Amino acid sequence: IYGGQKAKPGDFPWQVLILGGTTAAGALLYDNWVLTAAHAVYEQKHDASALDIRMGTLKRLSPHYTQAWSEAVFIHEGYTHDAGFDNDIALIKLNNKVVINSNITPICLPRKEAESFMRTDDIGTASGWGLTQRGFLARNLMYVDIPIVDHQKCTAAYEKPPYPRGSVTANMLCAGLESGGKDSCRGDAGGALVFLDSETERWFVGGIVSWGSMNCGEAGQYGVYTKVINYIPWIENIISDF
Amino acid sequence: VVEEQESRVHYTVCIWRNGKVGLSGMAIADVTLLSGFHALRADLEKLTSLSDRYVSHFETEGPHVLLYFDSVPTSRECVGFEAVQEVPVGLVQPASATLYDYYNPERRCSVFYGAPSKSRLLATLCSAEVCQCAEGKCPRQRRALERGLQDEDGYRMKFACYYPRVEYGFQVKVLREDSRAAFRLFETKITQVLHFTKDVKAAANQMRNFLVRASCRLRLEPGKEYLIMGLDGATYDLEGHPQYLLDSNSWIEEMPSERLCRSTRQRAACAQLNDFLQEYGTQGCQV
Amino acid sequence: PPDDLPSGRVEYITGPGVTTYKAVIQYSCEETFYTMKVNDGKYVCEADGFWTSSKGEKSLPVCEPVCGLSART
Amino acid sequence: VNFQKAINEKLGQYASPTAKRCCQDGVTRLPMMRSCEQRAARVQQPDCREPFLSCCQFAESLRKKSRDKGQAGLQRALEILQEEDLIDEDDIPVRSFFPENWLWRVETVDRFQILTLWLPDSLTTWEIHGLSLSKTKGLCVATPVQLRVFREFHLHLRLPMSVRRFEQLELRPVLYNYLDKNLTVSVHVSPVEGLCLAGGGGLAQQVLVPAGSARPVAFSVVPTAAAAVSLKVVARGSFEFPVGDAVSKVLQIEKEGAIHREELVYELNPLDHRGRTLEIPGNSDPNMIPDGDFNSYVRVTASDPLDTLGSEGALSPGGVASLLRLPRGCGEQTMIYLAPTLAASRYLDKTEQWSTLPPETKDHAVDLIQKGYMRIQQFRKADGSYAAWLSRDSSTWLTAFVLKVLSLAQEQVGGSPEKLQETSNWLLSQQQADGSFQDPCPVLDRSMQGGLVGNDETVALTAFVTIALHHGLAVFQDEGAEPLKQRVEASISKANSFLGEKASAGLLGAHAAAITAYALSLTKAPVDLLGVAHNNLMAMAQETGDNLYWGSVTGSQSNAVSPTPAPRNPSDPMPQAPALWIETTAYALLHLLLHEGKAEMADQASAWLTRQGSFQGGFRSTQDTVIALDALSAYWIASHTTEERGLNVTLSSTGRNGFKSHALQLNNRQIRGLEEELQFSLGSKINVKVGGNSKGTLKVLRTYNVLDMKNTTCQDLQIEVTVKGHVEYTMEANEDYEDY
Ligand SMILES: *[C@@H]1O[C@H](CO)[C@@H](O[C@@H]2O[C@H](CO)[C@@H](O[C@@H]3O[C@H](CO)[C@@H](O)[C@H](O)[C@@H]3O)[C@H](O)[C@H]2NC(C)=O)[C@H](O)[C@H]1NC(C)=O
Ligand SMILES: *[C@@H]1O[C@H](CO)[C@@H](O[C@@H]2O[C@H](CO)[C@@H](O[C@@H]3O[C@H](CO)[C@@H](O)[C@H](O)[C@@H]3O)[C@H](O)[C@H]2NC(C)=O)[C@H](O)[C@H]1NC(C)=O
């Protein structure tokens, strides 16, 4: 997380750290599934237990953590690992059920009526261990509170100058300040863009950290997140059948 | 080769000498690598070719890494190198490493080392049907008074006297579990003796050692009392008593508690167990 | 004895450790972090020797994780 | 890119190639994470340390500042990658391995001839050359003809070198398709016992292999056997395509524990009634792993000289180097191909016993000596000295050992007497004013536990050089008789004066006194020094039973009893002495043969050496082996007789395969080795009944796997091995922790 502050115990009990060929993050679903980005996990996708999955801790360098082992990795078939992040979503199945406790609770899947909380300019939260404002990976968990950006306003800010055409798509949502300074960065991919359901006082993930400007937090550039609600039947079909 | 996602680890070998006896002299560090791994040749040359003299020579013939040290220091001196697994091997067993004075091989030191904790190398890689084949040599795991799908009436007597025909039958209480190289050791105390062959003067309050391979999924928790019967092994412990290996020809079953045995469902089954123990413990297999 | 519940506890309503006919036990998943499904966990010892729920089922309840629950103010 | 420019810019600050090399070593990242200043303190030249430290500090600072920044892209994930390495300005590595030259031959061709040949596999096309030699028409060079070998479809199987049983193994045969068409292949592993395999072996798996591509196939297997299994992967193309290939390889599967070796030797003496019947208790080690079905191997011999130096001993095709069973990478170890082979030839030459062995042994002997000469000459320095390792400092001790051995071997290997004359001249330049020789980096130290190390080392080194210089006198002819031979003889006399006063002054160690006695006996020292050195050595002798040896005092356990070599019993095994004792008594035995000849002290000493040898060949290590075999060969020449002495021995044991009993006829004429050793059960005791008119030797080897090490294994030396995963180690390498 770029330009944020350090989280305290219990703030993000669904945060998952994933280590393999890439440094990435994830969000726990139920007690045996991890929600993350497809581009971050496609590396070593056919090796089931290749990923080092660590959760329930606030420090990346910590020797004490809760270990989880992956039984299988599911990548969305719509994703194309050439260039672009269309349909950037992946589900990781954990071999053993996680011990839900004070520092480990899953994030809720978004309801179909939860878009009343994902409105433009409303505040959302992103969290993860990424490149900080000083230029190095975070030694402890960081987070930002950022507002959602209009889809038309986000599309206009991309495809130029260096970005390829069709980078923004209907499966995405955006967030970030107009002036920059609050954004995700390299290492936060798969992290959960969470929103507060004030009617139930519960948190749910609405976006998955995907891509953005190569220069993190640049003014006039916004972070792009994979929208979860489009894949709710796809998530339920994999969890129920596999 | 290409891709395949190879497994890589990093070694660290430290040597030092306590006391001034056997001072200096050329010593050889013999490291037996874990199964499937071979030491990376590139990093090994950095120990000898650089201006830093961390080793004088190295040989990589076989699964062994031979390191030539000119002298063994009093304070720790450590050498590290990468190792890469060519063919994936899971459930890896610990291996030995040995440091010895070349011209005085009586001064030596051998030690075991294992894979890093919470590493995927300790997890299995067997396919579903292969795992079922793998435990064909492993002891059967059952809770108290549990009936198998093929266990017809009189199954305990059939196991003891027909097949695999038990040679020793004990009733022990598990005291403590120790982890040895590729084996788990359970220190037990015998509470009742049913039959024995090689283990003469086996009695109550006598202590024995029961071992099982690390691959098998059986675990004997301390504080519980088990019925154990099988065939006597060939090894002995520190006091001279024989040791026992638990495999597919061994019958292990935790004995039911008083509260569970008088339950309506298990009362009939608990009677079969005690009737068998009195029958076999008194008259043996002379049916 | 009642079958232990994953991520849950069992409470004797009738009396300490009484498991005989018509005795009542109350299952409970670990509070806050878990919630119970299928049934509400009230079980009574039936005449056939099986613990039966209020609905008449002989199998255990299931505890389900409660998602969300952040410590932010 | 930016890292390469900055490092090369730092290298540009040093113009000298010495400074550049010291700087280039600094920027190279050590495998283990040692601190830069801590690492820089090791280099031995301060003029090299100053640029090494500056470049190492700049490289680490630059590498950590640039760390975590690389791999730019629109993605928000971060690839884990190791730290950038300097791309060397040294020469690039051109390929150096090529398939061996098959069809390298010469054939008698009359007018014309056709050769049926089987083509080795490869992807590179090769050309065949030819030379015709005719007595009447002369030489002719044939024009090259091309032969292109190619593969339509290739199966490649890899398996580990060593696998413990019950380890989960996923073997990955790779299907290589060179055809321009997509190919569907049916692959399967043939069923074989001892392997838990999918479908019990022979489970077909359909794999599509694209054109010009490779596809690994995953099979799961776990070995349950304890020996070795040959597994065969079969691949066959479906449809009407005849493509297909099969690979069969042997997978070595080992037992769970770690190998433990127990070697005990027993004296066979039927002359006394106490040795006619003896019992071997077997093994009952508490650390031995269960199962396994281990065996105990027994070697009974009454023909000790021929078994040690014959076709089954020092003159084996692989020589004693394969019997000693230690790595021989060092330079001194090269003489294990030379000094034992030379001693074996000396025994057979002086006893005229070559006719008994097969005649190919002489070819084995000259091959071993030429192999040692060819290897040891790689360590020769420009000035005639020898170094322990290549590009290492010269060792005075090793230079002496080479001269002592290569002086005898140069005639049969085609050596140069001029080079050995150059070698001895360098040794003479190392003699100090006192007459002692000095080594700036000796290979052996040995003299430990016992104090006064400088006195023992200088005397033992001086005596070792003089023994080497005396053997070097055999090289000289008429050319060096006046200029060089007079210098060497004067140098030996000057050093003998140093050894003479140190022997007369006394207080020398047992090892230093033994080599001094042989030095003053090989060289014809004056009778006063020759006698006092013998009397000084005999005062340190230890005698028990019919054995005579020289040992060392390992302090005292507070107030302890004095008679240390008191216990002895022919029914008990002979304790294996340390290497220092073997080398000391070997020099004393060599001194005894020259001073007194074949005597009762020579018999008692040599009988101890004969009963101190290891199971399958040598002694404790290389240095003690070459000197003990040199001493025993000299004794066996002196004590050789034509009598048919032998013994009768009967061994029996109740093993797991029933009661087995063997009755053996042993005598001096036999050659008994590996093929004659007996097999008994590891746990079962063995009963031996001996009878005859001569003494013998019985050795037992018990090797088994243990699940734990002894509690007294690591009293002095210590070794600790740890291993970490790559992701855990790399993040720990780039770690900035306990700070901010
Ligand atoms: C022989 O094997 C090759 C490699 O597996 C097969 O190539 C694959 O062919 C399919 C069909 O043409 C390609 O899918 C198509 O890709 C284009 C873009 O190139 C897209 O516009 C289409 O909608 C469709 O998705 C596929 O990409 C290609 N594989 C790769 C790696 O590019 C080939 O088809 C095989 N031959 C036969 C006769 O099936
Ligand atoms: C080791 O044992 C063998 C026999 O197991 C000994 O060979 C035996 O030697 C004796 C004396 O030389 C031979 O005695 C002869 O026996 C015949 C038959 O009774 C008799 O007619 C002769 O007058 C003479 O007494 C005996 O034949 C011979 N055994 C065999 C099978 O040839 C051998 O001497 C023993 N060696 C040692 C070193 O103890």
PDB file of C-alpha atoms in Angstrom, chain D residues 7-181:
ATOM      1  CA  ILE D   7      29.802  -1.434 -10.936  1.00  0.00           C
ATOM      2  CA  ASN D   8      31.910  -0.961 -14.072  1.00  0.00           C
ATOM      3  CA  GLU D   9      32.270   2.705 -13.102  1.00  0.00           C
ATOM      4  CA  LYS D  10      33.584   1.571  -9.713  1.00  0.00           C
ATOM      5  CA  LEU D  11      35.946  -0.867 -11.452  1.00  0.00           C
ATOM      6  CA  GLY D  12      37.210   2.023 -13.592  1.00  0.00           C
ATOM      7  CA  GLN D  13      38.694   3.614 -10.455  1.00  0.00           C
ATOM      8  CA  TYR D  14      41.302   0.811 -10.290  1.00  0.00           C
ATOM      9  CA  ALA D  15      43.784   0.629 -13.165  1.00  0.00           C
ATOM     10  CA  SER D  16      45.884  -2.340 -12.022  1.00  0.00           C
ATOM     11  CA  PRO D  17      44.662  -5.855 -12.908  1.00  0.00           C
ATOM     12  CA  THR D  18      45.434  -6.957  -9.345  1.00  0.00           C
ATOM     13  CA  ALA D  19      43.167  -4.194  -8.029  1.00  0.00           C
ATOM     14  CA  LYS D  20      40.465  -5.048 -10.580  1.00  0.00           C
ATOM     15  CA  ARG D  21      40.510  -8.739  -9.628  1.00  0.00           C
ATOM     16  CA  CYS D  22      40.345  -7.911  -5.914  1.00  0.00           C
ATOM     17  CA  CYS D  23      37.512  -5.471  -6.662  1.00  0.00           C
ATOM     18  CA  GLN D  24      35.642  -7.931  -8.898  1.00  0.00           C
ATOM     19  CA  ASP D  25      35.740 -10.513  -6.097  1.00  0.00           C
ATOM     20  CA  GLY D  26      34.251  -7.907  -3.758  1.00  0.00           C
ATOM     21  CA  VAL D  27      31.209  -7.122  -5.895  1.00  0.00           C
ATOM     22  CA  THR D  28      30.484 -10.844  -6.292  1.00  0.00           C
ATOM     23  CA  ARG D  29      27.895 -11.877  -3.708  1.00  0.00           C
ATOM     24  CA  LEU D  30      28.981 -14.691  -1.402  1.00  0.00           C
ATOM     25  CA  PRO D  31      26.497 -17.596  -1.140  1.00  0.00           C
ATOM     26  CA  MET D  32      26.163 -17.360   2.647  1.00  0.00           C
ATOM     27  CA  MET D  33      25.262 -13.955   4.082  1.00  0.00           C
ATOM     28  CA  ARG D  34      28.498 -12.806   5.702  1.00  0.00           C
ATOM     29  CA  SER D  35      28.939  -9.149   6.621  1.00  0.00           C
ATOM     30  CA  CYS D  36      31.015  -7.195   4.117  1.00  0.00           C
ATOM     31  CA  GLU D  37      33.680  -6.015   6.568  1.00  0.00           C
ATOM     32  CA  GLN D  38      33.607  -9.437   8.233  1.00  0.00           C
ATOM     33  CA  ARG D  39      34.111 -11.013   4.802  1.00  0.00           C
ATOM     34  CA  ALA D  40      36.814  -8.539   3.744  1.00  0.00           C
ATOM     35  CA  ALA D  41      38.996  -9.393   6.759  1.00  0.00           C
ATOM     36  CA  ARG D  42      39.808 -12.831   5.312  1.00  0.00           C
ATOM     37  CA  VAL D  43      41.925 -11.802   2.310  1.00  0.00           C
ATOM     38  CA  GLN D  44      45.614 -12.192   3.103  1.00  0.00           C
ATOM     39  CA  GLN D  45      47.018  -9.152   1.264  1.00  0.00           C
ATOM     40  CA  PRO D  46      46.231  -5.682   2.673  1.00  0.00           C
ATOM     41  CA  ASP D  47      47.015  -4.211  -0.754  1.00  0.00           C
ATOM     42  CA  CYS D  48      44.209  -6.474  -2.006  1.00  0.00           C
ATOM     43  CA  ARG D  49      42.018  -5.891   1.059  1.00  0.00           C
ATOM     44  CA  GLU D  50      41.726  -2.128   0.536  1.00  0.00           C
ATOM     45  CA  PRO D  51      40.097  -2.294  -2.941  1.00  0.00           C
ATOM     46  CA  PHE D  52      38.186  -5.458  -1.996  1.00  0.00           C
ATOM     47  CA  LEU D  53      36.623  -3.710   1.005  1.00  0.00           C
ATOM     48  CA  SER D  54      35.733  -0.550  -0.931  1.00  0.00           C
ATOM     49  CA  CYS D  55      34.059  -2.415  -3.803  1.00  0.00           C
ATOM     50  CA  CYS D  56      32.252  -4.827  -1.468  1.00  0.00           C
ATOM     51  CA  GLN D  57      30.868  -1.895   0.530  1.00  0.00           C
ATOM     52  CA  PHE D  58      29.784  -0.026  -2.608  1.00  0.00           C
ATOM     53  CA  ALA D  59      28.249  -3.119  -4.218  1.00  0.00           C
ATOM     54  CA  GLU D  60      26.172  -4.040  -1.158  1.00  0.00           C
ATOM     55  CA  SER D  61      25.017  -0.450  -0.596  1.00  0.00           C
ATOM     56  CA  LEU D  62      24.082  -0.037  -4.265  1.00  0.00           C
ATOM     57  CA  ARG D  63      22.405  -3.456  -4.405  1.00  0.00           C
ATOM     58  CA  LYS D  64      20.205  -2.801  -1.363  1.00  0.00           C
ATOM     59  CA  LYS D  65      19.292   0.711  -2.539  1.00  0.00           C
ATOM     60  CA  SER D  66      18.247  -0.714  -5.922  1.00  0.00           C
ATOM     61  CA  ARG D  67      16.603  -3.709  -4.214  1.00  0.00           C
ATOM     62  CA  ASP D  68      12.836  -4.287  -4.660  1.00  0.00           C
ATOM     63  CA  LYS D  69      12.706  -1.660  -7.444  1.00  0.00           C
ATOM     64  CA  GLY D  70      13.190  -3.798 -10.550  1.00  0.00           C
ATOM     65  CA  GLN D  71      10.744  -5.604 -12.836  1.00  0.00           C
ATOM     66  CA  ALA D  72       8.673  -2.610 -13.894  1.00  0.00           C
ATOM     67  CA  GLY D  73       5.213  -3.137 -15.327  1.00  0.00           C
ATOM     68  CA  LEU D  74       1.553  -2.234 -15.132  1.00  0.00           C
ATOM     69  CA  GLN D  75       0.866  -5.220 -12.861  1.00  0.00           C
ATOM     70  CA  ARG D  76       0.540  -4.648  -9.117  1.00  0.00           C
ATOM     71  CA  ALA D  77       2.225  -7.957  -8.258  1.00  0.00           C
ATOM     72  CA  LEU D  78       5.961  -8.113  -7.580  1.00  0.00           C
ATOM     73  CA  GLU D  79       8.121 -10.918  -8.950  1.00  0.00           C
ATOM     74  CA  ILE D  80      10.661 -12.324  -6.498  1.00  0.00           C
ATOM     75  CA  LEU D  81      14.119 -12.312  -8.078  1.00  0.00           C
ATOM     76  CA  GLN D  82      17.673 -12.662  -6.814  1.00  0.00           C
ATOM     77  CA  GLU D  83      20.074  -9.733  -6.627  1.00  0.00           C
ATOM     78  CA  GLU D  84      21.694  -8.648  -9.883  1.00  0.00           C
ATOM     79  CA  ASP D  85      25.131 -10.125 -10.542  1.00  0.00           C
ATOM     80  CA  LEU D  86      27.966  -8.435 -12.391  1.00  0.00           C
ATOM     81  CA  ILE D  87      28.263  -9.631 -15.986  1.00  0.00           C
ATOM     82  CA  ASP D  88      31.947 -10.509 -16.184  1.00  0.00           C
ATOM     83  CA  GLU D  89      34.361  -8.793 -18.539  1.00  0.00           C
ATOM     84  CA  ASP D  90      36.298 -12.069 -18.463  1.00  0.00           C
ATOM     85  CA  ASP D  91      36.074 -14.342 -21.490  1.00  0.00           C
ATOM     86  CA  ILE D  92      32.699 -15.956 -22.191  1.00  0.00           C
ATOM     87  CA  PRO D  93      32.372 -19.758 -21.847  1.00  0.00           C
ATOM     88  CA  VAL D  94      32.290 -21.488 -25.233  1.00  0.00           C
ATOM     89  CA  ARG D  95      30.743 -24.968 -25.188  1.00  0.00           C
ATOM     90  CA  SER D  96      33.255 -27.624 -24.140  1.00  0.00           C
ATOM     91  CA  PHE D  97      31.374 -30.959 -23.942  1.00  0.00           C
ATOM     92  CA  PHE D  98      30.864 -32.972 -27.131  1.00  0.00           C
ATOM     93  CA  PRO D  99      29.822 -36.595 -27.734  1.00  0.00           C
ATOM     94  CA  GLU D 100      32.669 -39.092 -27.725  1.00  0.00           C
ATOM     95  CA  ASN D 101      34.227 -40.083 -31.045  1.00  0.00           C
ATOM     96  CA  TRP D 102      32.567 -43.360 -31.969  1.00  0.00           C
ATOM     97  CA  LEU D 103      34.075 -45.307 -34.887  1.00  0.00           C
ATOM     98  CA  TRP D 104      37.628 -44.337 -33.870  1.00  0.00           C
ATOM     99  CA  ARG D 105      39.377 -47.405 -35.255  1.00  0.00           C
ATOM    100  CA  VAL D 106      41.660 -48.838 -37.931  1.00  0.00           C
ATOM    101  CA  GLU D 107      40.414 -51.585 -40.256  1.00  0.00           C
ATOM    102  CA  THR D 108      42.168 -53.791 -42.804  1.00  0.00           C
ATOM    103  CA  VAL D 109      40.354 -53.121 -46.092  1.00  0.00           C
ATOM    104  CA  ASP D 110      41.098 -55.195 -49.202  1.00  0.00           C
ATOM    105  CA  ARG D 111      39.991 -53.252 -52.305  1.00  0.00           C
ATOM    106  CA  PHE D 112      36.624 -52.547 -50.675  1.00  0.00           C
ATOM    107  CA  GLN D 113      34.801 -53.406 -47.460  1.00  0.00           C
ATOM    108  CA  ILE D 114      31.442 -52.602 -45.859  1.00  0.00           C
ATOM    109  CA  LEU D 115      30.982 -51.982 -42.125  1.00  0.00           C
ATOM    110  CA  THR D 116      27.639 -52.536 -40.404  1.00  0.00           C
ATOM    111  CA  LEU D 117      27.355 -49.955 -37.628  1.00  0.00           C
ATOM    112  CA  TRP D 118      24.886 -48.907 -34.939  1.00  0.00           C
ATOM    113  CA  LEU D 119      24.417 -45.154 -34.701  1.00  0.00           C
ATOM    114  CA  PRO D 120      24.630 -43.389 -31.318  1.00  0.00           C
ATOM    115  CA  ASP D 121      21.860 -40.866 -30.763  1.00  0.00           C
ATOM    116  CA  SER D 122      22.283 -37.080 -30.979  1.00  0.00           C
ATOM    117  CA  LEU D 123      20.690 -34.085 -32.677  1.00  0.00           C
ATOM    118  CA  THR D 124      23.911 -32.758 -34.244  1.00  0.00           C
ATOM    119  CA  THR D 125      24.933 -34.036 -37.661  1.00  0.00           C
ATOM    120  CA  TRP D 126      28.479 -35.393 -37.829  1.00  0.00           C
ATOM    121  CA  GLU D 127      31.013 -36.153 -40.554  1.00  0.00           C
ATOM    122  CA  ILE D 128      33.200 -39.248 -40.914  1.00  0.00           C
ATOM    123  CA  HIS D 129      36.896 -38.910 -41.763  1.00  0.00           C
ATOM    124  CA  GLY D 130      39.275 -41.537 -43.083  1.00  0.00           C
ATOM    125  CA  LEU D 131      42.988 -42.194 -43.596  1.00  0.00           C
ATOM    126  CA  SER D 132      44.284 -44.989 -45.835  1.00  0.00           C
ATOM    127  CA  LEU D 133      47.777 -46.382 -45.205  1.00  0.00           C
ATOM    128  CA  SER D 134      49.071 -48.622 -48.001  1.00  0.00           C
ATOM    129  CA  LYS D 135      52.549 -50.145 -48.072  1.00  0.00           C
ATOM    130  CA  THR D 136      52.792 -49.658 -51.856  1.00  0.00           C
ATOM    131  CA  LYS D 137      50.503 -46.667 -52.505  1.00  0.00           C
ATOM    132  CA  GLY D 138      51.110 -44.676 -49.316  1.00  0.00           C
ATOM    133  CA  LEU D 139      48.908 -42.387 -47.270  1.00  0.00           C
ATOM    134  CA  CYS D 140      45.588 -41.034 -48.527  1.00  0.00           C
ATOM    135  CA  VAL D 141      43.114 -38.675 -46.857  1.00  0.00           C
ATOM    136  CA  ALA D 142      39.472 -39.435 -47.607  1.00  0.00           C
ATOM    137  CA  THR D 143      36.979 -36.669 -48.244  1.00  0.00           C
ATOM    138  CA  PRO D 144      34.529 -36.250 -45.338  1.00  0.00           C
ATOM    139  CA  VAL D 145      31.054 -37.754 -45.695  1.00  0.00           C
ATOM    140  CA  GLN D 146      28.118 -36.295 -43.779  1.00  0.00           C
ATOM    141  CA  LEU D 147      25.793 -38.349 -41.582  1.00  0.00           C
ATOM    142  CA  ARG D 148      22.847 -36.526 -40.003  1.00  0.00           C
ATOM    143  CA  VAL D 149      21.287 -38.247 -36.986  1.00  0.00           C
ATOM    144  CA  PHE D 150      17.863 -36.943 -35.966  1.00  0.00           C
ATOM    145  CA  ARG D 151      14.956 -37.959 -33.742  1.00  0.00           C
ATOM    146  CA  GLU D 152      11.307 -37.884 -34.771  1.00  0.00           C
ATOM    147  CA  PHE D 153      10.157 -38.220 -31.149  1.00  0.00           C
ATOM    148  CA  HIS D 154      12.250 -38.343 -27.981  1.00  0.00           C
ATOM    149  CA  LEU D 155      11.464 -39.606 -24.474  1.00  0.00           C
ATOM    150  CA  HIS D 156      13.692 -38.420 -21.618  1.00  0.00           C
ATOM    151  CA  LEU D 157      13.393 -39.732 -18.053  1.00  0.00           C
ATOM    152  CA  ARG D 158      15.140 -38.292 -14.993  1.00  0.00           C
ATOM    153  CA  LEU D 159      15.257 -39.886 -11.542  1.00  0.00           C
ATOM    154  CA  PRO D 160      17.200 -39.044  -8.366  1.00  0.00           C
ATOM    155  CA  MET D 161      20.548 -40.593  -7.523  1.00  0.00           C
ATOM    156  CA  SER D 162      19.433 -41.790  -4.070  1.00  0.00           C
ATOM    157  CA  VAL D 163      15.886 -42.264  -2.758  1.00  0.00           C
ATOM    158  CA  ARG D 164      14.914 -43.456   0.709  1.00  0.00           C
ATOM    159  CA  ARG D 165      12.144 -46.042   0.770  1.00  0.00           C
ATOM    160  CA  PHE D 166       8.571 -44.818   1.393  1.00  0.00           C
ATOM    161  CA  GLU D 167       9.458 -41.350   0.080  1.00  0.00           C
ATOM    162  CA  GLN D 168       6.791 -39.902  -2.209  1.00  0.00           C
ATOM    163  CA  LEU D 169       8.286 -39.498  -5.690  1.00  0.00           C
ATOM    164  CA  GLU D 170       6.720 -37.900  -8.775  1.00  0.00           C
ATOM    165  CA  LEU D 171       8.868 -38.818 -11.773  1.00  0.00           C
ATOM    166  CA  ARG D 172       8.550 -36.512 -14.789  1.00  0.00           C
ATOM    167  CA  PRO D 173       9.375 -38.080 -18.159  1.00  0.00           C
ATOM    168  CA  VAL D 174       9.482 -35.373 -20.828  1.00  0.00           C
ATOM    169  CA  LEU D 175       8.105 -35.971 -24.325  1.00  0.00           C
ATOM    170  CA  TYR D 176      10.165 -34.177 -26.984  1.00  0.00           C
ATOM    171  CA  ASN D 177       8.528 -33.718 -30.400  1.00  0.00           C
ATOM    172  CA  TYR D 178      10.729 -32.618 -33.304  1.00  0.00           C
ATOM    173  CA  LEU D 179       8.078 -33.253 -35.972  1.00  0.00           C
ATOM    174  CA  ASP D 180       6.153 -30.412 -37.618  1.00  0.00           C
ATOM    175  CA  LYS D 181       2.804 -32.028 -36.712  1.00  0.00           C
TER     176      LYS D 181
END
